[PDB]
Design a protein around this ligand. Structure first.
Ligand SMILES: Nc1nc2c(ncn2[C@@H]2O[C@@H]3COP(=O)(O)O[C@H]4[C@@H](O)[C@H](n5cnc6c(=O)[nH]c(N)nc65)O[C@@H]4COP(=O)(O)O[C@H]3[C@H]2O)c(=O)[nH]1
Ligand SMILES: Nc1nc2c(ncn2[C@@H]2O[C@@H]3COP(=O)(O)O[C@H]4[C@@H](O)[C@H](n5cnc6c(=O)[nH]c(N)nc65)O[C@@H]4COP(=O)(O)O[C@H]3[C@H]2O)c(=O)[nH]1
Length: 268
């Protein structure tokens, strides 16, 4: 025979969970110690307690278990299997119903994007030429976001940062056809350029500035809307030159949906 401590041990439960079961009359010990008032169980009851605890593991309430114990369904493998399949069917439907909501949710998230784009209004500004030092990349890559994580650990090595709280994602066109991306900071001329990095000069330009209020992978969608109609709808025409992303305090990481990024679109 097993003591309540031995039983509770091999099932890793508390000893009063078992006295409780005894008070309910759900799981009664085979006999009570006639000289210590202790509870003692038979090895034949292990599989019975095992099934009781397996129901509790399925979050089945104890009063349910007590209902099964009384009307004999708990000690019947066919009636018990029936209870479990039924409960299984509910779990599957609760999952299906929630999965349907995720589709409706994801469909609703898409419409929120168009609403955001419709609210991305342009502000026109002219800015003089300024110098940028950082890690450049020559070539039409299918990575940028990787250039940034390639660039963030070496940011410290840039001396003479005129304004360290703002950085730039510059994209310059080449008569090549290819484009030239550079991630860096505005720094005054004369300071040394860390090894493996470059100094890029952004010319003076007229700009249309669109505030992208979203994630960084979502930046491309803003660019698409900008060149598909947003400039035209405002009678502005893009001009060949260098654009850039303007990251300041409003930027909170490439995957934070609360990040804001100004996109300086050169125009006529
Ligand atoms: N103080 C106390 N302890 C209990 C009681 N019921 C179970 N135990 C504990 O459970 C062990 C084995 O239980 P068992 O199957 O009755 O197996 C027992 C039982 O079959 C038999 N036995 C020993 N003493 C007595 C006794 O006073 N009366 C009876 N009828 N049988 C006894 O010898 C086996 C070995 O017993 P133990 O080595 O002492 O070890 C016992 C004892 O530590 C109880 O009412 N009082
Ligand atoms: N046919 C049927 N009768 C229902 C239903 N819901 C309640 N009842 C009746 O109402 C009594 C108490 O229901 P309760 O307050 O929800 O209290 C319930 C509940 O808290 C728990 N319980 C028992 N069976 C189940 C079960 O299958 N699932 C769950 N989740 N809880 C149960 O234990 C109590 C059961 O006490 P009983 O003596 O069985 O008595 C039950 C039962 O006769 C139902 O969906 N179908």
């Amino acid at each position: 025979m097993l003591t309540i401590g031995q039983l509770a041990r091999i099932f890793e439960i508390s000893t009063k969970t078992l006295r409780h079961y005894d008070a309910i009359g759900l799981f009664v010990p085979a006999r009570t110690g006639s000289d210590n008032g202790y509870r003692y169980y038979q090895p034949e009851q292990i599989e019975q307690l095992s099934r009781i605890l397996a129901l509790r593991r399925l979050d089945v309430p104890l009063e349910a278990i007590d209902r099964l114990k009384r009307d004999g369904a708990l000690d019947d493998p066919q009636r018990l299997r029936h209870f479990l399949q039924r409960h299984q069917h509910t779990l599957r439907e609760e999952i299906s119903a929630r999965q349907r909501l995720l589709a409706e949710l994801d469909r609703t998230l898409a419409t929120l994007a168009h609403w955001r784009i419709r609210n991305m209004h342009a502000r026109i500004v002219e800015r003089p030429a300024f110098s940028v030092v950082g890690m450049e990349y020559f070539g039409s890559a299918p990575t940028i976001g990787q250039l940034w994580e390639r660039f963030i650990p070496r940011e410290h090595e840039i001396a003479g940062k005129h304004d360290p709280e703002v950085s730039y994602g510059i994209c310059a066109q080449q008569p090549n056809g290819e484009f030239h991306y550079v991630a860096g900071f505005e720094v005054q001329e004369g300071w040394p350029v860390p090894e493996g990095m470059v100094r890029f000069q952004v010319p003076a330009q007229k700009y249309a500035v669109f505030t992208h209020k979203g994630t960084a992978p979502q930046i491309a969608e803003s660019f698409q809307a900008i060149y598909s109609h947003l400039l035209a709808e405002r009678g502005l025409e893009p001009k060949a030159g260098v654009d850039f992303e303007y990251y300041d305090q409003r930027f909170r990481g490439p995957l934070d949906p609360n990040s804001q990024v100004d996109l300086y679109i050169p125009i006529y």
